[PDB]
Amino acid sequence: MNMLALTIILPLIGFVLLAFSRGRWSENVSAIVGVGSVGLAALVTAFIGVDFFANGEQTYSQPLWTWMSVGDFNIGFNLVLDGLSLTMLSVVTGVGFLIHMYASWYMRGEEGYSRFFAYTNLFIASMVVLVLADNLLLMYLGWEGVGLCSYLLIGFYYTDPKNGAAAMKAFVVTRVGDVFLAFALFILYNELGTLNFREMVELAPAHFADGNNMLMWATLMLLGGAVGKSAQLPLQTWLADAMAGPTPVSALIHAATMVTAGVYLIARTHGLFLMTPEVLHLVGIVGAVTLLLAGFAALVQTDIKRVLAYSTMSQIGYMFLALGVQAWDAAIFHLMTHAFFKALLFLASGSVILACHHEQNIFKMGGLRKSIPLVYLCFLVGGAALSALPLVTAGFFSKDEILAGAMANGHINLMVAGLVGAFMTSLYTFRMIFIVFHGSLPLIVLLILSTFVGALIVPPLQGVLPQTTELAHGSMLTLEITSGVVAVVGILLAAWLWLGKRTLVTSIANSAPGRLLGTWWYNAWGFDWLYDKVFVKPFLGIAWLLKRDPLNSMMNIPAVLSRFAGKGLLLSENGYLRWYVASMSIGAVVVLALLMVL
Amino acid sequence: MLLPWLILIPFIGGFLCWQTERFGVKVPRWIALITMGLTLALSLQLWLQGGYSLTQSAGIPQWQSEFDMPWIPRFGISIHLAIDGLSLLMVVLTGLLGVLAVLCSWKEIEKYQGFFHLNLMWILGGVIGVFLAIDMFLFFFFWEMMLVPMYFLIALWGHKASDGKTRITAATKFFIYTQASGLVMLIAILALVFVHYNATGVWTFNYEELLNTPMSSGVEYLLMLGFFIAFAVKMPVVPLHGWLPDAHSQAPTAGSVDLAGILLKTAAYGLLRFSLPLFPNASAEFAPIAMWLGVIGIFYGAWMAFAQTDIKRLIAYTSVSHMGFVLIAIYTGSQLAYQGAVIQMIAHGLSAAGLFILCGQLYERIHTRDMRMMGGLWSKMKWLPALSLFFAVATLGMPGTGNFVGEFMILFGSFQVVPVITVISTFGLVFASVYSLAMLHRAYFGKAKSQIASQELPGMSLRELFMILLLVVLLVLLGFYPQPILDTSHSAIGNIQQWFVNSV
């Protein structure tokens, strides 16, 4: 319980040791240090969870020191552990440990093996700091650490410049998100004098009784930071392009660390969002729109990895939809189950890439169900959990809790968008499955955890997040059977469209409206194009305009005038004596006339 | 009583560096190291014995130590030194950067190394004198005195790759900028002294006497403008910034002249110590113009840093952007933003020192500063690209480094005062991340763009590694535990802020 700081210290020690080793150690020692550091973090998390449940699930605060203290500006380096923090810490440490041992098997014979494990250890430490902070500034430290580690791990193969461009794009878009989060922090400290989550929740209704404008501004900026980190609208363009790194970093980013920080941020500051209901409805709308656009984008991708990236964007949209409909338990439950099955899917896709001699186009693949059965089984059950197959997958129960929470709060359009997205996610997931596959301890743990056994785990969110309004029994059963029917219908439609000879699919893909819509959704609705010609191109144009330093030349103007005036004055020194006498006479005339006029 | 020795030990040490050169060509570096370590140790002892953490704000003036000696009694000019928390932090930073500068040029075995070390110690003593002087004439004297060895170091000992005329031109531009702005400040100082002499009837160049000077509105604005023109040239504030990238690019290649000459922020200290207390009302009316000059400095410096093909020029423009942040902090009247400005001054000094030392070692390795010729250097060098990655990470305002603490405390206080300028400046922090990533990717990542970068390069020596890792440790400790630094400068900042907001 008091070893809550060990979950930060052990990954930090692993990063420091593996960074200063500089690749001199063997791969066995580097694997032992990195994987064992995250493993001891997971073991300490298990002991922490046992102790937390052993004393009535009481919130435990462990302060370490005071970070900053200037007058009323007091920011503490403290950790807090409640049910939400325990859930996030448990999923981060456990799934990161599984991904770490899979990467220990996976990254063998690679340059920067110890560098890879140092960067992933720093990623784990930053996310543990993010989820175990009681104030917004320490959470911001974990936020930036997670973004920096994402940038370092995405461009891990630094030799290819496109990996570096993907990493730079990821860091820049998420940094715009962090600027919005910084605005939220500035507003909240200026209004309430504190950044401690419990303290702002306590002091906000008294302070904002007369006026509630800056609270809406602060929650809107919190939402902007969240959509920056979680790759939602309008800061979602980095995810698909920047999943060009190695496979375990994509599993870590899309399952445990990167994309769940926005969900955790909205869930943690739920009281302030409760005081601003319009911004909460905006959170729900942003999630719904993002999940629909991500599903349509995943429907036309030609790589396994990009399909999985837009699927991650859709599932984070489902979590944002659950947050916007005041279904917080459903959002965290879907976070945990999606971490499970998305980690499983990304690890299986990495095994596909390794076995397929570095091939990524799905159409060049075919009939891989007989080449390897275990990878096909992992992809099958991960797709079933992604498609919310009823009663055999945890994703069904998570998405059904989300849809029930949207139904019970009077949200019709968000629930309709969720059902449409469920049909679309069955469609794109098994389109990828049937195109690719027709025509081991981490994998086992994620294999069982992606089934209903993962749905047997209940996050201890009672007393942290408010209870969702319960649905009527008949309405809940009709929603259950409607979601199951929609998922099964999408399964059968994908089977009818892609399992055999794709005649109808190719006929409507090659049509002019079909080609237009396919090339529109393939580029993710043109947001990359819009941000290139709205932010990137004027930045580069202003840089090329200013590369001469115009202000320096403007301040060099007086020197040029000095040279010109001096060269002009030197013409009077021609060396002629009679001109010197004439100039003395001219000066005498000027002096005498000036004395006469004054 | 130790402040005269704080200034004198560098001067005597530079004289002994020149004199002991005849005993051997490896002797002046040891002498410079001993006297820079002695200056650092004396400043650390002043820090330990000052008790700055338990010091309350009693109002300007409030000095932990003070020395006075008559110098030119006809004008009421004295050697008047005084140390308090802000000056002490700046002096300790100057001593640490001076030790780093001596260690940085350790492998210079040239025939005239004693004169190099004398010029270095004279620059460092002048900077310490700027931080300690409260007599206005003495402050101006140190201000303009530290530029002659700077000029000669740039002109004669500078970048070997460039021809002589380019180094002469850069040194001349730097000298003309700094001395003309200093003469405008001297005009302002003289006019303030004459206004006080007409009001009272006595000659004084003392800071404490000149504080209580009744001036009309408009005269005070002009004196403030002269002071600000000097400080804006040395900050640098746009457009008075053009001397800085050429002074950095033509500085000696090890980096010691960047550390000793530029990276000590005497102009921000001068704005806090003199411009705000002597002319508080004029500074209050100048606050919007100074804030927008800082905003333009942030964004202009970021765009210039991105557009550089020279890595040293890039780091110089990063310095311009960070000082735009500090300039926004200074004119805001907030204690939180002032403390952030102090942290940002120290952290920018440390991070720019690390960047410049690493750039000098990289130029020693590959014999070119053009980033279009170096690429994929992560696979060629043992330590340098990782430490350069750390320092570029620090310069974008990474939490865990002191740059984040300074920048964000500045932004918190500024938002409490001026919100629009603050939001534009945070987008400037995005611009900072852009130029840092661009430098990192153009230098150390990717494929080799020439033949020199395609081969293995020698590893960093133990001395270079030690000084870089010391800078790394100090920046990390400043990021995670900035409280001793905040407690050291709390009383001085409180006095300056209370004087500024109680007189407006």
Ligand SMILES: CCCCCCCCCCCCCCCCCC(=O)OC[C@H](COP(=O)(O)OCCN)OC(=O)CCCCCCCCCCCCCCCCC
């Ligand atoms: C609150 C908990 C934390 C929460 C999140 C915090 C986030 C912010 C963290 C900021 C720290 C810097 C992060 C980025 C570091 C980048 C440098 C790095 O790790 O480089 C890796 C490199 C090893 O790579 P490799 O390829 O094997 O090298 C062989 C040839 N170069 O390494 C090397 O070559 C050698 C090492 C180079 C420098 C490594 C980083 C130094 C700074 C961190 C440790 C500082 C020392 C610890 C003590 C500080 C004082 C108490």
Ligand SMILES: CCCCCCCCCCCCCCCCCC(=O)OC[C@H](COP(=O)(O)OCCN)OC(=O)CCCCCCCCCCCCCCCCC
């Ligand atoms: C904020 C603005 C308002 C307040 C300003 C206050 C004044 C002080 C602070 C600003 C100083 C600006 C100085 C501008 C010139 C800087 C020096 C320079 O650019 O020198 C260039 C050049 C040396 O280069 P070189 O290669 O040796 O020459 C070629 C061969 N002849 O040099 C030469 O060739 C000859 C140089 C002669 C001296 C330069 C001319 C100075 C004249 C006084 C200017 C005062 C400011 C005017 C108003 C501001 C500018 C619009």
